[PDB]
Design a protein around this motif. Structure first.
Motif, PDB file in Angstrom:
ATOM      1  N   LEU A  41       8.131  57.156 105.137  1.00  0.00           N
ATOM      2  CA  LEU A  41       9.235  56.601 104.356  1.00  0.00           C
ATOM      3  C   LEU A  41      10.479  56.397 105.217  1.00  0.00           C
ATOM      4  N   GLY A  42      10.836  57.379 106.047  1.00  0.00           N
ATOM      5  CA  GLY A  42      12.008  57.252 106.904  1.00  0.00           C
ATOM      6  C   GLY A  42      11.878  56.127 107.915  1.00  0.00           C
ATOM      7  N   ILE A  43      10.724  56.015 108.576  1.00  0.00           N
ATOM      8  CA  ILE A  43      10.475  54.925 109.528  1.00  0.00           C
ATOM      9  C   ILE A  43      10.518  53.580 108.789  1.00  0.00           C
ATOM     10  N   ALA A  44       9.967  53.511 107.572  1.00  0.00           N
ATOM     11  CA  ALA A  44       9.989  52.285 106.788  1.00  0.00           C
ATOM     12  C   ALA A  44      11.407  51.906 106.340  1.00  0.00           C
ATOM     13  N   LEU A  45      12.259  52.871 105.981  1.00  0.00           N
ATOM     14  CA  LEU A  45      13.677  52.648 105.683  1.00  0.00           C
ATOM     15  C   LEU A  45      14.433  52.108 106.905  1.00  0.00           C
ATOM     16  N   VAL A  46      14.175  52.582 108.128  1.00  0.00           N
ATOM     17  CA  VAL A  46      14.776  51.983 109.342  1.00  0.00           C
ATOM     18  C   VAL A  46      14.255  50.563 109.593  1.00  0.00           C
ATOM     19  N   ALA A  47      12.955  50.320 109.431  1.00  0.00           N
ATOM     20  CA  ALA A  47      12.364  48.988 109.577  1.00  0.00           C
ATOM     21  C   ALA A  47      12.900  47.978 108.546  1.00  0.00           C
ATOM     22  N   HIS A  48      13.130  48.391 107.296  1.00  0.00           N
ATOM     23  CA  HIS A  48      13.748  47.540 106.280  1.00  0.00           C
ATOM     24  C   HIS A  48      15.214  47.272 106.572  1.00  0.00           C
ATOM     25  N   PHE A  49      15.947  48.254 107.092  1.00  0.00           N
ATOM     26  CA  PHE A  49      17.321  47.972 107.497  1.00  0.00           C
ATOM     27  C   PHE A  49      17.363  46.997 108.672  1.00  0.00           C
ATOM     28  N   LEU A  50      16.491  47.157 109.674  1.00  0.00           N
ATOM     29  CA  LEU A  50      16.389  46.228 110.808  1.00  0.00           C
ATOM     30  C   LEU A  50      15.981  44.827 110.353  1.00  0.00           C
ATOM     31  N   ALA A  51      15.053  44.727 109.405  1.00  0.00           N
ATOM     32  CA  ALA A  51      14.717  43.462 108.782  1.00  0.00           C
ATOM     33  C   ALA A  51      15.915  42.859 108.035  1.00  0.00           C
ATOM     34  N   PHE A  52      16.727  43.640 107.315  1.00  0.00           N
ATOM     35  CA  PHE A  52      17.917  43.100 106.672  1.00  0.00           C
ATOM     36  C   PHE A  52      18.906  42.560 107.700  1.00  0.00           C
ATOM     37  N   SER A  53      19.063  43.256 108.825  1.00  0.00           N
ATOM     38  CA  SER A  53      20.031  42.854 109.840  1.00  0.00           C
ATOM     39  C   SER A  53      19.588  41.671 110.695  1.00  0.00           C
ATOM     40  N   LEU A  54      18.297  41.537 111.017  1.00  0.00           N
ATOM     41  CA  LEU A  54      17.795  40.561 112.002  1.00  0.00           C
ATOM     42  C   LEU A  54      17.112  39.317 111.395  1.00  0.00           C
ATOM     43  N   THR A  55      16.887  39.284 110.082  1.00  0.00           N
ATOM     44  CA  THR A  55      16.052  38.294 109.366  1.00  0.00           C
ATOM     45  C   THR A  55      16.878  37.525 108.327  1.00  0.00           C
ATOM     46  N   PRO A  56      16.513  36.298 107.912  1.00  0.00           N
ATOM     47  CA  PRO A  56      17.169  35.618 106.783  1.00  0.00           C
ATOM     48  C   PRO A  56      16.884  36.224 105.391  1.00  0.00           C
ATOM     49  N   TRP A  57      16.116  37.313 105.291  1.00  0.00           N
ATOM     50  CA  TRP A  57      15.843  38.029 104.036  1.00  0.00           C
ATOM     51  C   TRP A  57      17.113  38.657 103.445  1.00  0.00           C
ATOM     52  N   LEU A  58      17.318  38.481 102.134  1.00  0.00           N
ATOM     53  CA  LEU A  58      18.543  38.827 101.397  1.00  0.00           C
ATOM     54  C   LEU A  58      19.816  38.167 101.953  1.00  0.00           C
ATOM     55  N   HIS A  59      19.708  37.084 102.737  1.00  0.00           N
ATOM     56  CA  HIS A  59      20.872  36.482 103.371  1.00  0.00           C
ATOM     57  C   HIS A  59      21.041  35.033 102.941  1.00  0.00           C
TER      58      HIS A  59
END
Ligand code: BCL
Ligand SMILES: CC(C)=CCC/C(C)=C/C=C/C(C)=C/C=C/C(C)=C/C=C/C=C(C)/C=C/C=C(C)/C=C/C=C(\C)CCCC(C)(C)O
Ligand SMILES: CC(C)=CCC/C(C)=C/C=C/C(C)=C/C=C/C(C)=C/C=C/C=C(C)/C=C/C=C(C)/C=C/C=C(\C)CCCC(C)(C)O
Ligand SMILES: CC(C)=CCC/C(C)=C/C=C/C(C)=C/C=C/C(C)=C/C=C/C=C(C)/C=C/C=C(C)/C=C/C=C(\C)CCCC(C)(C)O
Ligand SMILES: CC(C)=CCC/C(C)=C/C=C/C(C)=C/C=C/C(C)=C/C=C/C=C(C)/C=C/C=C(C)/C=C/C=C(\C)CCCC(C)(C)O
Ligand SMILES: CC(C)=CCC/C(C)=C/C=C/C(C)=C/C=C/C(C)=C/C=C/C=C(C)/C=C/C=C(C)/C=C/C=C(\C)CCCC(C)(C)O
Ligand SMILES: CC(C)=CCC/C(C)=C/C=C/C(C)=C/C=C/C(C)=C/C=C/C=C(C)/C=C/C=C(C)/C=C/C=C(\C)CCCC(C)(C)O
Ligand SMILES: CC(C)=CCC/C(C)=C/C=C/C(C)=C/C=C/C(C)=C/C=C/C=C(C)/C=C/C=C(C)/C=C/C=C(\C)CCCC(C)(C)O
Ligand SMILES: CC(C)=CCC/C(C)=C/C=C/C(C)=C/C=C/C(C)=C/C=C/C=C(C)/C=C/C=C(C)/C=C/C=C(\C)CCCC(C)(C)O
Ligand SMILES: CC(C)=CCC/C(C)=C/C=C/C(C)=C/C=C/C(C)=C/C=C/C=C(C)/C=C/C=C(C)/C=C/C=C(\C)CCCC(C)(C)O
Ligand SMILES: CCCCCCCCCCCCO[C@@H]1O[C@H](CO)[C@@H](O[C@H]2O[C@H](CO)[C@@H](O)[C@H](O)[C@H]2O)[C@H](O)[C@H]1O
Ligand SMILES: CCCCCCCCCCCC[N+](C)(C)[O-]
Ligand SMILES: CCCCCCCCCCCC[N+](C)(C)[O-]
Ligand SMILES: CCCCCCCCCCCC[N+](C)(C)[O-]
Ligand SMILES: CCCCCCCCCCCC[N+](C)(C)[O-]
Ligand SMILES: CCCCCCCCCCCC[N+](C)(C)[O-]
Ligand SMILES: CCCCCCCCCCCC[N+](C)(C)[O-]
Ligand SMILES: CCCCCCCCCCCC[N+](C)(C)[O-]
Ligand SMILES: CCCCCCCCCCCC[N+](C)(C)[O-]
Ligand SMILES: CCCCCCCCCCCC[N+](C)(C)[O-]
Lengths: 48, 41, 48, 41, 48, 41, 48, 41, 48, 41, 48, 41, 48, 48, 48, 41, 41, 41
Positions: free
Chosen positions: L23-41
């Protein structure tokens, strides 16, 4: 009809279900093949 | 389990009679298909 | 109806589930075949 | 497990009655399909 | 409802999971069939 | 394992009551589908 | 909630993995079905 | 292995509480889908 | 015809169903291949 | 189960006669295909 | 975290491989779903 | 094989700590996806 | 030809059917691959 | 590296083949995914 | 070459067929991938 | 079952002779394919 | 079969060293992919 | 069945020699592919 010693080697409790199941699968595959490669069997299914 | 030679021959008569009954029904179905379908026509 | 000795050779605990399961699979395959090769069964599903 | 010859005949009566009940329901469903569908029409 | 002797022949530990699993698979196949052959079920999923 | 004839009839009452409960929920879902959907309309 | 005698007939070591696995497979199939039949779920995945 | 009638009822309480917990999370997810999605809108 | 010692190593109750089943599957695959890559076999199925 | 060397040779004669019977029927089917089909023509 | 009695009913030698294997399969299915329904993940794979 | 109640609780602590680490690794991967990807943007 | 100790480790009743079955599957896959990626093998099947 | 008690619960004769086989399948799926969603990996295979 | 204790944990009668079968499946998948993503391998199969 | 070292070497001679017979038939089939097909031409 | 706690820790050192060796080869392959490919470029 | 530590090391020499023989044949096949194909050209 001369192969009747085969149930001394093959278990009929495995081989007789395998025979009947293979015949039934083959009949479905032939029906599907005729349905997919003719216009008259889909037209018989359609009617009107 | 696997059968005695005599029991195997007794079982195979039912398998051969079942295949002959299937063959006969299939011969009627092929004749009906020849008569009612554009196949061979 | 003359095949009633078959449960002396085939285990009915395997063969009776195989029979009922094969009949149910065949009925699904026939329904799917009619749905995919007619316009009236998709039109009955659609309505309006 | 596999049955006695008498037990096999007793079981097969339920299999044949089940297949006759299925056949009857299928004969009503095919008649309803003939009446309500463009099939054979 | 007259078939209640079937658990003398079929093991209920195999047959009752097979029954419930077959019913669940059939319900998924019917839902998928209606989704793929109507416009109103995809339109209900889409909204707007 | 396979059951006694009496134990089989006791188990089959739960199977038949489960199928009747499933049938009733499916009859409500089909009525809701008739009312809310272009099916049969 | 009235079906609690079922673990006298079905082995819970087989049936409880089958239940949880069937629920998880069903949730994946529903998500895939919504992804393939809407424009808004692929558009949410796309962003920008 | 299969359980005693009392052990079966004790196990089924955890199965029913697990299904109620799953149902509650699914009811929140469906409400969030109603609020954030063009579904039913 | 010189391979007749193979039933000292392979169980004929497994290997003889595998042989007959492999031959039957191969014959279906060849028939399907000819049906899908010629016009004359679908035209023979069609008639008229 | 696996056979004695003598029993294996006795079984393999039926396997080889079955394959020769299959080969002969296939040779007639290939000749009929050569005569009735545009194959090799 | 309150489900810790489950290893009295489910064999952990079957259930723990099933858990880890299901999680790994789910992660592959989610990655494939995102790859097939976005332009930015194939564009990240492409570069240039 | 299936465990004692105490052994089951000891094993489940490793399963829950493994799921919390995932869960913790997945929470970091989802934050990195929010920051680096057009997802939620 | 120097690998002849392998039947001290692998059961030949499993491994010899696996070898012959793998060779037969490979030959079918190669034939299918040539049929699907050439015009001359479908043209040989077609004739005329 | 702190999970080393897992071989007291999971049989390593099943779990170590499952681990190595899962890693190998994953590597094939990633290679296939990159081949199907880029132009540069098919162009490297093509050359000229 | 330093992994030689693995046959104390993995049964070589299962693991050595799994190794050889995985290598053979991988070689078929690579050949199929090259056939489907180049023009020169289908052109070599075609000739003329 | 798994064999003695001597029995394994005796069995592997039949496996190697079978593979050499398969190789020879495949070498004739590849030569016939070179002669009758547009492959390598 | 399942191992003693000490035998399990001895086996897991080979699993962790195998995963570290795989990770290192994959880190070289990703660097070679960064250098030779349009990825991240 | 699983082997003694000494028997395992004796078996793994044949596995490693088999993989080295496969690697060598694959290195010749890759060189032939470099020479006869538009790959890397
Ligand atoms: C034919 C000579 C023997 C016989 C020889 C065999 C043999 C041999 C076998 C069976 C087997 C079976 N038999 Mg029988 N069987 C006989 C009489 C019967 C009777 C009966 C008269 O009441 C019944 C109910 C059964 C029932 C059964 C099933 C339990 C089982 C599977 C059959 C199958 O898949 O058929 C599929 C159906 C057909 C081939 C018939 C074709 C369709 C029918 C005639 C009409 C359908 C009409 C449709 C609803 C409407 C269409 C309308 C359109 C306008 C055309 N048999 C007679 C006495 N039976 C098999 C078995 O034991 O399996 C485990 C098996 O091997
Ligand atoms: C287009 C393409 C792709 C392909 C196209 C086509 C294609 C390839 C087709 C190929 C078709 C083929 C090969 C068809 C073959 C069909 C066959 C062989 C059918 C055989 C049917 C056999 C039956 C029904 C047997 C019933 C046995 C029975 C009922 C046995 C009963 C036994 C009992 C009661 C036990 C008694 C024991 C006791 C000691 C008590 O007496
Ligand atoms: C378009 C294409 C591709 C194809 C198109 C079509 C196509 C090919 C179709 C083919 C269709 C076919 C073949 C259909 C065949 C259908 C059949 C045969 C149905 C049979 C139904 C049988 C039933 C329902 C049996 C119930 C048995 C039962 C309930 C048994 C109960 C037993 C008990 C209680 C045990 C008592 C023991 C004790 C000692 C205690 O008395
Ligand atoms: C468009 C296309 C292709 C196809 C379209 C459609 C198509 C073909 C549809 C076909 C649909 C069909 C066939 C549907 C059939 C549905 C059926 C039959 C549902 C049955 C449900 C049964 C249930 C839910 C049973 C629950 C049993 C239960 C809970 C049992 C509990 C037992 C217990 C507690 C043990 C107690 C023991 C002790 C000794 C302790 O008392
Ligand atoms: C669009 C299409 C095609 C289809 C669309 C949709 C479609 C069809 C949907 C269908 C959906 C369906 C049917 C959903 C059903 C969902 C269900 C039923 C969920 C159930 C969840 C159950 C859970 C989570 C159970 C947990 C049990 C647990 C954790 C048990 C724990 C037990 C323990 C600890 C043992 C203690 C023993 C001791 C003696 C020691 O006390
Ligand atoms: C286009 C593409 C993709 C591919 C295209 C084509 C392609 C690749 C084709 C390849 C085709 C191949 C390879 C075909 C091979 C066919 C073969 C080998 C057929 C063999 C048939 C064998 C039979 C029928 C054996 C029957 C045995 C029998 C009946 C045995 C009976 C035994 C008994 C009674 C036991 C007595 C024991 C006691 C101690 C009592 O005497
Ligand atoms: C778009 C679509 C279609 C779908 C989209 C998405 C979708 C549906 C997603 C669904 C996702 C879901 C559900 C994800 C769930 C993820 C979960 C639950 C992850 C769990 C991870 C668990 C782990 C890693 C456990 C490790 C256990 C471990 C390491 C255990 C170690 C044990 C030991 C050492 C034994 C000690 C014993 C001794 C007695 C010796 O102490
Ligand atoms: C385009 C693409 C995708 C791919 C393209 C191509 C591609 C990848 C191709 C790859 C092809 C490959 C790898 C082919 C390999 C082929 C091989 C290895 C064939 C081997 C054949 C072996 C045989 C026939 C063995 C027969 C054994 C036999 C008969 C044994 C008999 C034993 C007996 C009698 C027991 C005596 C015991 C007693 C103690 C009594 O003496
Ligand atoms: C685009 C998409 C869809 C997806 C994209 C990507 C995606 C999801 C990727 C996911 C990738 C993942 C998760 C990768 C994970 C990779 C991992 C974990 C690799 C692990 C490798 C482990 C190895 C190699 C282990 C070797 C063990 C060994 C050799 C063990 C040897 C043991 C011995 C000798 C026994 C000694 C015993 C005695 C008592 C005698 O000492
Ligand atoms: C484009 C895409 C999607 C993907 C692209 C590509 C991709 C991912 C590729 C990946 C490729 C990979 C990973 C390839 C790996 C290949 C490997 C590792 C090959 C290994 C070969 C091993 C062999 C041949 C072993 C033979 C063993 C043998 C013969 C053993 C004999 C043993 C004996 C005689 C027992 C003696 C015992 C006694 C006690 C009697 O002495
Ligand atoms: C341990 C697990 C770790 C998981 C890590 C999760 C984070 C992954 C970050 C990946 C970054 C991808 O970054 C993304 O790249 C692509 C391609 O360059 C860009 O893509 C952009 O151009 C392409 C065309 O070339 C358009 O189709 C796309 O719509 C547009 O957004 C995105 O704007 C950028 O946000
Ligand atoms: C076409 C596929 C048909 C599959 C038939 C499978 C039959 C399996 C029979 C298993 C018999 C087991 N037992 C214990 C009764 O001997
Ligand atoms: C159409 C497929 C239907 C599959 C039916 C499978 C039935 C398996 C029955 C296994 C019976 C096992 N046992 C131990 C009770 O004899
Ligand atoms: C629709 C598919 C459903 C599959 C159901 C499979 C049930 C298997 C039950 C095995 C029971 C084994 N045992 C040892 C407890 O008797
Ligand atoms: C949705 C599919 C889920 C598959 C679940 C399979 C569970 C198998 C359990 C086997 C239990 C065996 N044993 C020996 C511990 O009783
Ligand atoms: C082409 C696939 C054909 C599958 C044939 C499967 C045969 C299985 C035979 C199992 C024999 C079991 N037993 C207990 C009788 O030895
Ligand atoms: C997502 C699929 C994962 C499949 C996992 C299969 C685990 C099987 C474990 C079998 C254990 C057998 N045994 C004898 C050690 O108890
Ligand atoms: C390419 C797939 C070929 C599958 C071959 C399967 C062979 C199974 C042999 C089982 C032997 C069982 N027994 C009891 C006789 O040792
Ligand atoms: C990614 C799939 C890999 C499949 C690996 C299957 C391993 C099965 C191991 C069975 C071990 C059996 N035995 C009797 C030696 O314990
Ligand atoms: C790439 C898939 C290859 C599948 C290989 C399967 C090997 C099964 C070996 C079973 C050995 C059984 N036994 C009784 C001889 O130990």
């Amino acid at each position: 009809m001369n192969q009747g010693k085969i149930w001394t080697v093959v278990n009929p409790a495995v081989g007789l279900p395998l025979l009947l199941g293979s015949v039934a699968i083959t009949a479905l595959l032939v029906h599907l093949a005729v349905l997919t490669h003719t216009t008259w069997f889909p037209a018989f299914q359609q009617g009107g | 389990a696997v059968l005695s030679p005599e029991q195997s021959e007794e079982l195979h008569k039912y398998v051969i009679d079942g295949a002959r009954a299937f063959l006969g029904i299939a011969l009627v179905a092929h004749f009906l298909a020849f008569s009612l379908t554009p196949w061979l026509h």
